[PDB]
Amino acid sequence: CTWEGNKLTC
């Protein structure tokens, strides 16, 4: 799980 702009994406 990592960050995308300011959302969490897994």
Q: Compute the distance between CA of residue 10 and CA of residue 6 in angstroms, rounded to an integer.
A: 13
Task: Give the determination technique.
Answer: NMR
Q: Are 1 and 9 in contact (CB under 8 A)?
A: yes
Pairing of strands 7-9, 2-4: antiparallel
Q: How far is Cα 10 from Cα 7, in angstroms, rounded to an integer?
A: 10
Instruction: Give the single-character DSSP code of 5.
Output: T
Gap sites in the chain (C to N > 2.5 Å), preceding residue numbers: none
Report the residue count for the chain: 10
